[PDB]
Amino acid sequence: LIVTQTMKGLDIQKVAGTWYSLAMAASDISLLDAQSAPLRVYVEELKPTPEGDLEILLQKWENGECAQKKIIAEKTKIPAVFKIDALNENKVLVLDTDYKKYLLFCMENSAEPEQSLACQCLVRTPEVDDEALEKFDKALKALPMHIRLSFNPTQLEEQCHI
């Protein structure tokens, strides 16, 4: 309810497998600032369960080391929207995907006021996808982002993007 872009007809089973966090954007600079900033997470694999929840394997720079983490995004009644438990619990939205090349998604808080939001362009291969990046930029102009990060094919192949 800042993000009002979801993918129609999402088949969550088809997002299974390998992904690369080619680009990231966020509403607040401090969310993506340093290696260890809170939302600087690098996706490695999407694992939908048979019951339709979404597990996410990612890397996070935790204590001077690139750490391995597993999150479960629980399904909702909207197939493009998932929910994560926490103090504040946060929605994950799938904005758009072709399954085979790119997926765009955003993470937001239920706050108020306090927009607060981060989005990624995920790609299947360690390549700069011009088309994906255009679509990411379109989805973003509707949103109030203040930091934007981009990674090259060498960094994409490194734990925690170098």
Side-chain angles (χ1 to χ4, degrees):
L1 232 59
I2 319 286
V3 194
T4 54
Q5 176 181 353
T6 46
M7 206 214 159
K8 297 230 205 172
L10 170 63
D11 177 1
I12 201 71
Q13 280 317 308
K14 301 217 262 159
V15 310
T18 302
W19 292 100
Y20 291 75
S21 302
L22 169 66
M24 315 186 171
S27 59
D28 172 10
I29 289 162
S30 72
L31 293 175
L32 289 183
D33 249 348
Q35 300 168 293
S36 63
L39 279 76
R40 196 133 145 194
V41 302
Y42 310 95
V43 174
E44 297 295 292
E45 184 183 333
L46 293 178
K47 336 213 295 190
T49 73
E51 307 90 17
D53 291 335
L54 186 69
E55 304 192 351
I56 318 145
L57 304 195
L58 63 269
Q59 295 151 1
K60 228 321 230 163
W61 195 276
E62 258 212 320
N63 282 315
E65 69 162 281
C66 186
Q68 194 89 352
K69 275 196 64 198
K70 197 203 277 203
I71 326 179
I72 195 164
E74 292 196 74
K75 79 172 201 306
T76 76
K77 259 59 263 146
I78 305 163
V81 181
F82 294 84
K83 88 230 163 217
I84 300 153
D85 210 337
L87 224 203
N88 155 30
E89 78 110 68
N90 305 303
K91 271 151 222 159
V92 170
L93 312 250
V94 180
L95 312 205
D96 193 24
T97 178
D98 71 1
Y99 309 104
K100 17 152 294 294
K101 290 223 203 59
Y102 78 94
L103 186 145
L104 312 176
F105 84 84
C106 292
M107 309 158 274
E108 82 179 278
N109 57 200
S110 300
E112 264 129 24
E114 299 301 63
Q115 299 205 245
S116 196
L117 172 73
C119 308
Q120 304 206 176
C121 190
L122 290 190
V123 287
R124 289 291 204 178
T125 68
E127 291 183 294
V128 185
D129 189 329
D130 283 334
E131 179 191 347
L133 285 177
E134 259 152 35
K135 301 187 154 169
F136 186 56
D137 277 346
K138 293 162 168 62
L140 262 27
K141 73 186 176 292
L143 304 177
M145 308 312 205
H146 291 270
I147 179 164
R148 209 212 163 259
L149 312 167
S150 217
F151 307 94
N152 64 43
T154 305
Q155 297 169 147
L156 288 180
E157 281 291 273
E158 301 290 15
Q159 307 272 119
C160 287
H161 284 18
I162 276 192

